[PDB]
mmCIF file of C-alpha atoms and ligand atoms in Angstrom:
data_model
loop_
_atom_site.group_PDB
_atom_site.id
_atom_site.type_symbol
_atom_site.label_atom_id
_atom_site.label_comp_id
_atom_site.label_asym_id
_atom_site.label_seq_id
_atom_site.Cartn_x
_atom_site.Cartn_y
_atom_site.Cartn_z
ATOM 1 C CA UNK A 1 0.234 -0.608 -0.114
ATOM 2 C CA UNK A 2 3.082 2.720 0.239
ATOM 3 C CA UNK A 3 3.784 2.037 -3.395
ATOM 4 C CA UNK A 4 5.120 6.023 -3.665
ATOM 5 C CA UNK A 5 7.578 8.305 -2.085
ATOM 6 C CA UNK A 6 6.504 11.904 -1.840
ATOM 7 C CA UNK A 7 8.257 14.345 -4.311
ATOM 8 C CA UNK A 8 8.789 17.948 -3.939
ATOM 9 C CA UNK A 9 7.090 20.882 -6.790
ATOM 10 C CA UNK A 10 10.494 22.217 -7.415
ATOM 11 C CA UNK A 11 13.805 20.788 -7.170
ATOM 12 C CA UNK A 12 15.330 23.942 -6.003
ATOM 13 C CA UNK A 13 13.446 26.755 -4.517
ATOM 14 C CA UNK A 14 14.560 30.045 -4.273
ATOM 15 C CA UNK A 15 14.227 32.137 -1.104
ATOM 16 C CA UNK A 16 15.185 35.351 0.274
ATOM 17 C CA UNK A 17 14.853 36.529 4.067
ATOM 18 C CA UNK A 18 16.198 40.263 5.136
ATOM 19 C CA UNK A 19 18.732 40.229 7.471
ATOM 20 C CA UNK A 20 17.854 41.279 11.189
ATOM 21 C CA UNK A 21 14.329 39.936 10.650
ATOM 22 C CA UNK A 22 12.599 39.102 13.911
ATOM 23 C CA UNK A 23 12.052 35.193 14.781
ATOM 24 C CA UNK A 24 9.248 33.917 13.340
ATOM 25 C CA UNK A 25 9.600 35.940 10.098
ATOM 26 C CA UNK A 26 8.458 33.453 7.357
ATOM 27 C CA UNK A 27 10.978 32.975 4.223
ATOM 28 C CA UNK A 28 10.115 35.100 0.971
ATOM 29 C CA UNK A 29 9.820 32.413 -1.615
ATOM 30 C CA UNK A 30 9.658 33.191 -4.937
ATOM 31 C CA UNK A 31 8.714 30.103 -6.863
ATOM 32 C CA UNK A 32 5.224 28.809 -5.019
ATOM 33 C CA UNK A 33 5.028 27.741 -1.601
ATOM 34 C CA UNK A 34 7.326 24.880 -0.464
ATOM 35 C CA UNK A 35 4.919 21.276 -1.070
ATOM 36 C CA UNK A 36 5.609 17.912 -1.447
ATOM 37 C CA UNK A 37 3.165 15.538 -2.801
ATOM 38 C CA UNK A 38 3.081 11.783 -2.398
ATOM 39 C CA UNK A 39 0.811 9.841 -4.631
ATOM 40 C CA UNK A 40 -0.714 6.983 -2.235
ATOM 41 C CA UNK A 41 -3.723 6.899 -0.907
ATOM 42 C CA UNK A 42 -4.793 7.460 2.507
ATOM 43 C CA UNK A 43 -2.216 7.216 4.944
ATOM 44 C CA UNK A 44 0.814 6.905 3.127
ATOM 45 C CA UNK A 45 0.542 10.374 1.255
ATOM 46 C CA UNK A 46 1.146 12.636 4.311
ATOM 47 C CA UNK A 47 4.265 14.001 4.814
ATOM 48 C CA UNK A 48 6.712 15.316 7.227
ATOM 49 C CA UNK A 49 9.123 18.021 6.374
ATOM 50 C CA UNK A 50 13.176 18.578 7.565
ATOM 51 C CA UNK A 51 15.414 21.248 6.691
ATOM 52 C CA UNK A 52 18.965 20.106 6.744
ATOM 53 C CA UNK A 53 22.343 21.749 6.099
ATOM 54 C CA UNK A 54 25.060 23.835 7.326
ATOM 55 C CA UNK A 55 23.084 26.836 8.592
ATOM 56 C CA UNK A 56 20.074 24.891 9.044
ATOM 57 C CA UNK A 57 19.980 26.606 12.674
ATOM 58 C CA UNK A 58 19.119 29.485 11.979
ATOM 59 C CA UNK A 59 15.605 28.387 10.986
ATOM 60 C CA UNK A 60 12.937 26.083 11.848
ATOM 61 C CA UNK A 61 10.593 24.477 9.826
ATOM 62 C CA UNK A 62 6.703 23.488 10.396
ATOM 63 C CA UNK A 63 6.760 19.908 9.809
ATOM 64 C CA UNK A 64 3.456 20.015 8.858
ATOM 65 C CA UNK A 65 3.236 22.843 6.449
ATOM 66 C CA UNK A 66 6.915 23.266 5.420
ATOM 67 C CA UNK A 67 6.813 26.480 5.682
ATOM 68 C CA UNK A 68 10.391 28.187 6.996
ATOM 69 C CA UNK A 69 10.545 30.646 9.891
ATOM 70 C CA UNK A 70 13.736 32.433 11.506
ATOM 71 C CA UNK A 71 14.113 30.553 14.470
ATOM 72 C CA UNK A 72 14.227 32.576 17.797
ATOM 73 C CA UNK A 73 17.357 32.729 19.766
ATOM 74 C CA UNK A 74 19.483 33.739 16.691
ATOM 75 C CA UNK A 75 20.345 37.188 14.624
ATOM 76 C CA UNK A 76 21.103 37.043 10.836
ATOM 77 C CA UNK A 77 23.850 39.437 10.029
ATOM 78 C CA UNK A 78 24.483 39.673 6.010
ATOM 79 C CA UNK A 79 28.133 41.071 6.864
ATOM 80 C CA UNK A 80 29.001 37.532 8.379
ATOM 81 C CA UNK A 81 28.240 35.780 5.256
ATOM 82 C CA UNK A 82 30.415 36.118 2.031
ATOM 83 C CA UNK A 83 29.080 35.098 -0.460
ATOM 84 C CA UNK A 84 25.503 36.552 1.140
ATOM 85 C CA UNK A 85 23.919 33.573 0.172
ATOM 86 C CA UNK A 86 22.593 30.354 2.047
ATOM 87 C CA UNK A 87 22.088 26.655 0.677
ATOM 88 C CA UNK A 88 19.717 24.196 2.766
ATOM 89 C CA UNK A 89 18.510 20.727 2.194
ATOM 90 C CA UNK A 90 14.880 20.113 1.862
ATOM 91 C CA UNK A 91 13.889 16.421 3.040
ATOM 92 C CA UNK A 92 10.054 15.180 2.750
ATOM 93 C CA UNK A 93 9.113 11.547 4.822
ATOM 94 C CA UNK A 94 6.005 9.081 4.497
ATOM 95 C CA UNK A 95 5.068 7.305 7.485
ATOM 96 C CA UNK A 96 7.211 4.248 6.430
ATOM 97 C CA UNK A 97 10.346 6.340 5.946
ATOM 98 C CA UNK A 98 10.261 6.865 2.138
ATOM 99 C CA UNK A 99 12.053 10.302 0.966
ATOM 100 C CA UNK A 100 11.438 13.230 -1.289
ATOM 101 C CA UNK A 101 14.096 16.144 -1.565
ATOM 102 C CA UNK A 102 14.624 19.493 -3.100
ATOM 103 C CA UNK A 103 16.920 22.240 -2.606
ATOM 104 C CA UNK A 104 16.337 25.588 -0.464
ATOM 105 C CA UNK A 105 18.872 28.450 -1.761
ATOM 106 C CA UNK A 106 18.238 31.615 0.218
ATOM 107 C CA UNK A 107 19.733 35.230 -0.277
ATOM 108 C CA UNK A 108 20.077 37.364 2.782
ATOM 109 C CA UNK A 109 19.180 40.851 1.590
ATOM 110 C CA UNK A 110 20.710 44.026 2.986
ATOM 111 C CA UNK A 111 19.433 46.277 5.968
ATOM 112 C CA UNK A 112 21.590 49.518 6.067
ATOM 113 C CA UNK A 113 22.973 48.608 9.703
ATOM 114 C CA UNK A 114 26.227 49.672 9.404
ATOM 115 C CA UNK A 115 27.699 53.180 9.854
ATOM 116 C CA UNK A 116 30.133 54.611 7.634
ATOM 117 C CA UNK A 117 33.326 54.859 10.077
ATOM 118 C CA UNK A 118 36.581 56.355 9.596
ATOM 119 C CA UNK A 119 39.749 55.113 10.648
ATOM 120 C CA UNK A 120 41.388 56.781 12.231
ATOM 121 C CA UNK A 121 38.737 59.299 13.218
ATOM 122 C CA UNK A 122 40.842 62.205 13.461
ATOM 123 C CA UNK A 123 43.303 64.175 10.946
ATOM 124 C CA UNK A 124 46.126 66.129 11.435
ATOM 125 C CA UNK A 125 47.883 67.826 8.560
ATOM 126 C CA UNK A 126 50.202 70.690 7.839
ATOM 127 C CA UNK A 127 49.590 72.897 4.912
ATOM 128 C CA UNK A 128 52.378 75.268 3.731
ATOM 129 C CA UNK A 129 50.984 78.892 2.890
ATOM 130 C CA UNK A 130 50.634 80.617 -0.429
ATOM 131 C CA UNK A 131 49.415 77.282 -1.926
ATOM 132 C CA UNK A 132 47.516 77.604 -4.880
ATOM 133 C CA UNK A 133 43.523 77.181 -5.705
ATOM 134 C CA UNK A 134 43.273 73.353 -6.227
ATOM 135 C CA UNK A 135 46.463 71.910 -4.330
ATOM 136 C CA UNK A 136 45.651 68.561 -2.742
ATOM 137 C CA UNK A 137 45.734 68.654 1.271
ATOM 138 C CA UNK A 138 44.585 65.543 2.194
ATOM 139 C CA UNK A 139 42.535 62.610 1.733
ATOM 140 C CA UNK A 140 40.129 60.945 4.090
ATOM 141 C CA UNK A 141 38.646 57.698 3.816
ATOM 142 C CA UNK A 142 35.331 56.000 5.581
ATOM 143 C CA UNK A 143 34.177 52.506 5.312
ATOM 144 C CA UNK A 144 31.030 50.911 5.154
ATOM 145 C CA UNK A 145 30.368 47.099 5.642
ATOM 146 C CA UNK A 146 27.481 47.161 3.892
ATOM 147 C CA UNK A 147 26.942 47.096 0.064
ATOM 148 C CA UNK A 148 24.886 48.187 -2.955
ATOM 149 C CA UNK A 149 23.820 52.375 -1.727
ATOM 150 C CA UNK A 150 24.095 50.962 1.864
ATOM 151 C CA UNK A 151 27.916 50.973 1.185
ATOM 152 C CA UNK A 152 28.220 53.698 -0.997
ATOM 153 C CA UNK A 153 29.591 56.736 0.246
ATOM 154 C CA UNK A 154 29.512 60.687 -0.316
ATOM 155 C CA UNK A 155 32.083 63.146 1.384
ATOM 156 C CA UNK A 156 30.869 66.288 2.697
ATOM 157 C CA UNK A 157 31.832 69.247 5.029
ATOM 158 C CA UNK A 158 29.377 70.146 7.630
ATOM 159 C CA UNK A 159 31.352 73.025 8.933
ATOM 160 C CA UNK A 160 34.756 74.194 9.644
ATOM 161 C CA UNK A 161 35.869 74.729 5.808
ATOM 162 C CA UNK A 162 35.236 78.680 5.868
ATOM 163 C CA UNK A 163 34.786 78.713 1.860
ATOM 164 C CA UNK A 164 38.679 78.005 2.148
ATOM 165 C CA UNK A 165 38.677 74.025 1.546
ATOM 166 C CA UNK A 166 36.498 72.088 -0.630
ATOM 167 C CA UNK A 167 35.835 68.158 -0.905
ATOM 168 C CA UNK A 168 35.305 65.709 -3.688
ATOM 169 C CA UNK A 169 32.466 63.883 -2.927
ATOM 170 C CA UNK A 170 33.671 60.510 -4.311
ATOM 171 C CA UNK A 171 37.185 60.313 -3.615
ATOM 172 C CA UNK A 172 37.241 62.527 -0.450
ATOM 173 C CA UNK A 173 40.338 64.693 -1.287
ATOM 174 C CA UNK A 174 40.147 67.729 -0.013
ATOM 175 C CA UNK A 175 41.443 70.108 -1.562
ATOM 176 C CA UNK A 176 42.005 74.136 -1.654
ATOM 177 C CA UNK A 177 39.201 76.408 -3.140
ATOM 178 C CA UNK A 178 39.140 80.216 -4.585
ATOM 179 C CA UNK A 179 40.560 81.881 -1.622
ATOM 180 C CA UNK A 180 44.193 82.185 -0.680
ATOM 181 C CA UNK A 181 45.564 80.866 2.487
ATOM 182 C CA UNK A 182 47.694 83.045 4.809
ATOM 183 C CA UNK A 183 48.803 81.686 8.063
ATOM 184 C CA UNK A 184 48.690 85.267 9.257
ATOM 185 C CA UNK A 185 44.908 85.488 8.523
ATOM 186 C CA UNK A 186 44.383 82.201 10.096
ATOM 187 C CA UNK A 187 46.965 79.581 11.429
ATOM 188 C CA UNK A 188 44.441 77.147 11.923
ATOM 189 C CA UNK A 189 41.653 75.503 10.669
ATOM 190 C CA UNK A 190 39.344 72.541 11.976
ATOM 191 C CA UNK A 191 36.766 70.935 9.608
ATOM 192 C CA UNK A 192 34.121 68.394 10.761
ATOM 193 C CA UNK A 193 34.134 66.004 7.575
ATOM 194 C CA UNK A 194 30.953 63.799 7.250
ATOM 195 C CA UNK A 195 30.793 60.483 5.281
ATOM 196 C CA UNK A 196 27.404 59.355 4.140
ATOM 197 C CA UNK A 197 25.751 56.612 2.754
ATOM 198 C CA UNK A 198 22.979 56.147 0.439
ATOM 199 C CA UNK A 199 20.406 53.848 2.222
ATOM 200 C CA UNK A 200 16.757 54.874 2.423
ATOM 201 C CA UNK A 201 17.502 55.912 5.643
ATOM 202 C CA UNK A 202 21.147 57.208 4.801
ATOM 203 C CA UNK A 203 23.440 56.701 7.970
ATOM 204 C CA UNK A 204 26.917 59.202 8.661
ATOM 205 C CA UNK A 205 29.636 59.252 10.264
ATOM 206 C CA UNK A 206 32.235 61.905 10.566
ATOM 207 C CA UNK A 207 35.662 62.932 11.153
ATOM 208 C CA UNK A 208 37.593 66.159 12.641
ATOM 209 C CA UNK A 209 40.539 67.150 10.132
ATOM 210 C CA UNK A 210 42.649 69.775 12.104
ATOM 211 C CA UNK A 211 44.772 71.737 9.187
ATOM 212 C CA UNK A 212 47.693 73.285 10.394
ATOM 213 C CA UNK A 213 49.231 76.411 8.296
ATOM 214 C CA UNK A 214 52.804 76.441 8.042
ATOM 215 C CA UNK A 215 54.657 79.591 7.388
ATOM 216 C CA UNK A 216 56.581 81.414 5.193
ATOM 217 C CA UNK A 217 58.195 84.510 6.251
ATOM 218 C CA UNK A 218 55.886 86.838 3.759
ATOM 219 C CA UNK A 219 54.955 89.843 5.433
ATOM 220 C CA UNK A 220 56.866 93.202 5.785
ATOM 221 C CA UNK A 221 57.370 94.572 8.844
ATOM 222 C CA UNK A 222 55.131 97.664 9.860
ATOM 223 C CA UNK A 223 55.884 100.623 12.127
ATOM 224 C CA UNK A 224 53.342 101.143 14.944
ATOM 225 C CA UNK A 225 54.222 104.747 15.181
ATOM 226 C CA UNK A 226 55.087 105.548 11.761
ATOM 227 C CA UNK A 227 54.792 109.410 11.880
ATOM 228 C CA UNK A 228 56.223 111.815 14.729
ATOM 229 C CA UNK A 229 57.223 115.291 15.206
ATOM 230 C CA UNK A 230 59.436 116.088 18.235
ATOM 231 C CA UNK A 231 60.450 119.200 19.494
ATOM 232 C CA UNK A 232 64.478 118.997 21.183
ATOM 233 C CA UNK A 233 66.439 121.565 22.672
ATOM 234 C CA UNK A 234 69.294 123.152 21.194
ATOM 235 C CA UNK A 235 71.376 121.569 24.218
ATOM 236 C CA UNK A 236 70.606 117.916 23.827
ATOM 237 C CA UNK A 237 74.038 116.402 24.044
ATOM 238 C CA UNK A 238 74.726 113.322 21.900
ATOM 239 C CA UNK A 239 73.780 110.263 23.476
ATOM 240 C CA UNK A 240 70.334 111.708 24.378
ATOM 241 C CA UNK A 241 67.347 109.492 23.544
ATOM 242 C CA UNK A 242 64.857 111.372 22.057
ATOM 243 C CA UNK A 243 62.134 109.202 20.323
ATOM 244 C CA UNK A 244 61.797 105.547 19.627
ATOM 245 C CA UNK A 245 60.917 103.799 16.594
ATOM 246 C CA UNK A 246 58.684 100.447 17.052
ATOM 247 C CA UNK A 247 57.523 97.516 14.296
ATOM 248 C CA UNK A 248 55.649 94.664 14.203
ATOM 249 C CA UNK A 249 56.344 91.536 11.862
ATOM 250 C CA UNK A 250 53.253 88.890 12.501
ATOM 251 C CA UNK A 251 55.361 86.134 10.835
ATOM 252 C CA UNK A 252 56.851 83.756 12.882
ATOM 253 C CA UNK A 253 60.870 84.285 13.300
ATOM 254 C CA UNK A 254 61.223 87.838 12.754
ATOM 255 C CA UNK A 255 64.936 89.492 12.833
ATOM 256 C CA UNK A 256 64.119 93.437 12.675
ATOM 257 C CA UNK A 257 66.878 95.976 12.020
ATOM 258 C CA UNK A 258 66.093 99.265 12.364
ATOM 259 C CA UNK A 259 67.960 101.836 9.659
ATOM 260 C CA UNK A 260 68.112 105.985 9.408
ATOM 261 C CA UNK A 261 68.222 105.774 5.581
ATOM 262 C CA UNK A 262 68.185 109.768 5.083
ATOM 263 C CA UNK A 263 68.397 113.303 7.008
ATOM 264 C CA UNK A 264 67.310 116.207 5.517
ATOM 265 C CA UNK A 265 68.435 119.642 7.499
ATOM 266 C CA UNK A 266 67.084 122.840 7.011
ATOM 267 C CA UNK A 267 68.015 126.302 8.164
ATOM 268 C CA UNK A 268 65.342 128.417 10.399
ATOM 269 C CA UNK A 269 65.490 130.272 6.530
ATOM 270 C CA UNK A 270 64.123 126.657 5.176
ATOM 271 C CA UNK A 271 67.123 126.403 2.956
ATOM 272 C CA UNK A 272 68.431 122.851 3.283
ATOM 273 C CA UNK A 273 72.154 122.164 5.089
ATOM 274 C CA UNK A 274 74.441 119.916 3.518
ATOM 275 C CA UNK A 275 75.809 116.785 5.034
ATOM 276 C CA UNK A 276 73.678 115.855 7.566
ATOM 277 C CA UNK A 277 73.988 112.351 7.625
ATOM 278 C CA UNK A 278 75.303 111.839 11.016
ATOM 279 C CA UNK A 279 72.984 114.122 13.112
ATOM 280 C CA UNK A 280 70.988 111.421 14.633
ATOM 281 C CA UNK A 281 71.777 107.490 14.843
ATOM 282 C CA UNK A 282 69.225 104.985 15.634
ATOM 283 C CA UNK A 283 69.680 101.852 17.488
ATOM 284 C CA UNK A 284 69.563 98.317 15.441
ATOM 285 C CA UNK A 285 67.530 96.153 17.776
ATOM 286 C CA UNK A 286 65.180 98.620 19.696
ATOM 287 C CA UNK A 287 64.667 101.452 17.293
ATOM 288 C CA UNK A 288 65.995 103.668 20.208
ATOM 289 C CA UNK A 289 66.540 107.616 18.136
ATOM 290 C CA UNK A 290 69.505 109.233 20.068
ATOM 291 C CA UNK A 291 71.005 112.553 18.912
ATOM 292 C CA UNK A 292 74.523 112.112 17.596
ATOM 293 C CA UNK A 293 76.228 115.516 16.605
ATOM 294 C CA UNK A 294 75.448 118.995 18.649
ATOM 295 C CA UNK A 295 72.981 120.813 17.557
ATOM 296 C CA UNK A 296 71.964 124.053 17.096
ATOM 297 C CA UNK A 297 69.116 126.340 16.211
ATOM 298 C CA UNK A 298 71.207 128.710 14.371
ATOM 299 C CA UNK A 299 72.563 125.882 11.739
ATOM 300 C CA UNK A 300 70.048 123.499 11.837
ATOM 301 C CA UNK A 301 66.663 124.448 13.072
ATOM 302 C CA UNK A 302 64.734 121.328 11.581
ATOM 303 C CA UNK A 303 65.358 117.631 10.566
ATOM 304 C CA UNK A 304 63.602 115.167 8.474
ATOM 305 C CA UNK A 305 64.612 111.915 9.614
ATOM 306 C CA UNK A 306 63.529 108.825 7.477
ATOM 307 C CA UNK A 307 63.421 105.548 9.073
ATOM 308 C CA UNK A 308 63.293 101.666 7.708
ATOM 309 C CA UNK A 309 62.992 98.375 8.736
ATOM 310 C CA UNK A 310 63.689 95.089 7.054
ATOM 311 C CA UNK A 311 63.020 91.691 8.471
ATOM 312 C CA UNK A 312 66.424 89.663 7.917
ATOM 313 C CA UNK A 313 64.526 86.664 7.867
ATOM 314 C CA UNK A 314 62.195 87.376 5.106
ATOM 315 C CA UNK A 315 61.625 84.791 2.743
ATOM 316 C CA UNK A 316 60.440 86.964 -0.215
ATOM 317 C CA UNK A 317 62.311 90.289 -1.070
ATOM 318 C CA UNK A 318 59.572 91.948 -2.021
ATOM 319 C CA UNK A 319 57.624 91.666 1.608
ATOM 320 C CA UNK A 320 61.054 92.301 3.715
ATOM 321 C CA UNK A 321 61.033 96.253 4.698
ATOM 322 C CA UNK A 322 58.285 98.519 5.447
ATOM 323 C CA UNK A 323 55.849 100.578 3.762
ATOM 324 C CA UNK A 324 55.281 103.278 4.795
ATOM 325 C CA UNK A 325 58.712 104.253 6.142
ATOM 326 C CA UNK A 326 58.938 105.703 9.174
ATOM 327 C CA UNK A 327 59.173 109.363 9.260
ATOM 328 C CA UNK A 328 60.252 111.595 12.285
ATOM 329 C CA UNK A 329 60.266 115.207 12.056
ATOM 330 C CA UNK A 330 62.758 116.981 14.262
ATOM 331 C CA UNK A 331 62.921 120.498 15.742
ATOM 332 C CA UNK A 332 65.031 122.341 17.271
ATOM 333 C CA UNK A 333 64.543 124.452 19.952
ATOM 334 C CA UNK A 334 66.393 128.193 21.239
ATOM 335 C CA UNK A 335 68.436 128.304 24.511
HETATM 336 CA CA1 CA B 401 4.049 7.489 0.818
HETATM 337 CA CA1 CA B 402 23.973 42.572 10.003
HETATM 338 CA CA1 CA B 403 23.860 45.316 6.011
HETATM 339 CA CA1 CA B 404 25.547 51.702 5.537
HETATM 340 CA CA1 CA B 405 51.449 85.370 5.090
HETATM 341 CA CA1 CA B 406 54.069 84.229 6.860
HETATM 342 CA CA1 CA B 407 58.538 89.347 7.492
HETATM 343 CA CA1 CA B 408 71.183 129.684 21.043
#
């Protein structure tokens, strides 16, 4: 009376389950329901299903209906199966222990469950100032363990760039935008850069980027006290300090030197007096200006002193002396 054994409707069943599906979630089975048929009559025609194989442990099968569901006490993770493909053996038994087989081929679908991740999370990089537009500063990289659009990453700067830095959305190369990079304008930058996936609930991971502007000595010394007039007793002896010129250089390691470059002497009748180059000296380091020759209103009533400062450490000649020069008028007073 048991002249037949069970026999599945298809020889391979193709099925898919979304990862992180909760327990009891049924398989989505693309080619009909799992079904086995035994052509005996009566009691010898009833079947009981088993599910067998390497990752059978992740599932349970109703032995009456052959429906397959996510076992409880387990979590299915697509990042733990490479390829994302599972192969299982369906077995069908009648009451005499006669068999039928078919094949369950299961694809784990992808859930956007992994964050774009920066390793390292932080970047510190030196960039020399006066760099041309488009100079590559660095490249940041993130990794997302998901795949398809869930793993594909667009880079962006959320803030800190100040319109002086741009980032290529794909490569993650950070480069210089339109504006120039002057260390004296700003000596560092902190960027919050963001890598974001394209899952339908997009996930993001961020990275701190610190950018450190190295110095070229490219900044000219500037007198803080560029015009003065001082009246000086005709009885002021040589060595007497009468004025002090001071300049400031915003580069990292200036060596400032102060020079008198002209002295122009005038009569109380306003005509030039020649060869008065030696009337005043200037301390080369402090900018302290002293009387140097003996004085007299009757010989020279006024001196126009012109004073300049040079950074010796300057890396560009064109930004190494003062503009303007310091001007000190000196006016002699009778006794
Ligand atoms: Ca049978
Ligand atoms: Ca997962
Ligand atoms: Ca995933
Ligand atoms: Ca992702
Ligand atoms: Ca500069
Ligand atoms: Ca500089
Ligand atoms: Ca300088
Ligand atoms: Ca006198």
